[PDB]
């Protein structure tokens, strides 16, 4: 397991630009593509994760678990009292899995503390937990990701509603914008400030898995069937091939099967 490190309390939007291509390197399958997109492992492709240090300011720090075949957080760690690594592994992680969190994260078994992320990763949930209808109303930025860092690195007992809102920040500002060249611009072009996400970096989010198979099927270009999306004003989109949609995606999710690599 390779972890790739972002220092969040300083940074340009060439160094955000890296760490993203770092991670998006790091997370692909070695030869696994189509139509020139990258694609997540299957399943079975060792490692299966990677781990992403996120630096923070005043030297707090917070490091994502993600898995690789899908790029979920499946947890986080933090320096925690003395010498404590403290993981916090999501609801939803399950079986052998939840082990690979707690050893992975925290290799030290002599040293770590566990805080359970008592809630799932889906976005309503954390939306709900947030106290908010949608994650639009949820701002994002450096300073607000960096911000989120200092209310959870090292402190004792945190509100859903905190731990909620850093989660919205991160997956978005780390699963979300490696897996979409779209989220990452619109990061980079708020770069200095803090921004409400858009119809089209929520939509894109909430359909990457469509238009990975969408890609994945398609023939000479063309989408198996026409796919409606939105685009930033919040107007229906309807793409109908790869051209129009391979310019918002750097990474896609794996889907079985051989298709167009190139
Ligand atoms: N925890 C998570 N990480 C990445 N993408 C997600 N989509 C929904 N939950 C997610």
């Known amino acids: 397991v390779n972890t790739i490190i972002y220092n969040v309390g300083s940074t340009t939007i060439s160094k955000y630009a890296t760490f993203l291509n770092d991670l998006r390197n790091e997370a692909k399958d070695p030869s696994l593509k189509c139509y020139g997109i990258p694609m997540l492992p299957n399943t079975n492709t060792n490692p299966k994760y990677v781990l992403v240090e996120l630096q923070g300011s005043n030297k707090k720090t917070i490091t994502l678990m993600l898995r690789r075949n899908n790029l979920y957080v499946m947890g986080y760690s933090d ?3 003395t010498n404590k690594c403290r993981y916090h592994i999501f609801n939803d992680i ?3 899995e939840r082990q690979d969190v707690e050893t992975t994260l925290c290799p030290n078994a002599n040293s770590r503390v566990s805080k359970n992320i ?3 990763s889906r976005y309503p949930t954390l939306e709900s937990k947030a106290g908010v209808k949608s994650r639009s109303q949820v701002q994002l930025g450096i300073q607000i990701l960096d911000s989120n860092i200092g209310k ?3 402190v004792m007992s945190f509100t ?3 731990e909620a809102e850093f989660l919205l920040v991160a997956i978005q500002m780390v699963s979300e914008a490696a897996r979409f060249k779209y989220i990452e611009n619109q990061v980079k072009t708020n770069f200095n400030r803090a921004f409400n996400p858009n119809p089209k970096v929520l939509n894109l989010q909430e359909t990457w898995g469509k238009i990975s198979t969408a890609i994945h099927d398609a023939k000479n270009g063309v989408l198996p069937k026409p796919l409606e999306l939105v685009d930033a004003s919040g107007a229906k989109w309807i793409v109908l091939r790869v ?3 391979k310019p918002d995606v750097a990474l896609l999710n794996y ?3 051989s298709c167009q690599t190139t």
Do not use: A, H, L
């Open 160 to 162: 859903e509603k905190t």
């Open 118 to 120: 008592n809630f799932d």
């Open 152 to 154: 959870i690195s090292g």
């Open 243 to 245: 051209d129009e949609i």
């Open 79 to 81: 320096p925690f009292e």
């Open 255 to 257: 889907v079985g099967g």
């Open 94 to 96: 399950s079986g052998t």
